[PDB]
Design a protein around this ligand. Structure first.
Ligand code: ZN
Ligand code: ZN
Length: 74
């Protein structure tokens, strides 16, 4: 290793952007942006592996460059 001095575009997206993944919620969760029970598409949305939030495939764009920060209750 120890290779790769430079050769990449300007990293200008967000500090700590949420990192969701295509997963199925066993139970109907509620969005944090739209605030609508995620039941459509057989409860298929986006779950963050950091804050553990639920958002529709469209409710993510609004939180694409939003600093990930979620509490730990439970
Ligand atoms: Zn997050
Ligand atoms: Zn939503």
């Amino acid at each position: 290793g120890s290779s790769g001095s430079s050769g990449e575009p300007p990293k200008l997206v967000n500090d700590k952007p949420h990192k969701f993944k295509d997963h199925f919620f066993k139970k109907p969760k509620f969005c944090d942006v739209c605030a609508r029970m995620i039941v459509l598409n057989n409860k298929f949305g986006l779950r963050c592996k950091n804050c553990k939030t639920n958002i529709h495939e469209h409710c993510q764009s609004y939180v694409e460059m939003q600093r990930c920060s979620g509490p730990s209750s439970g």
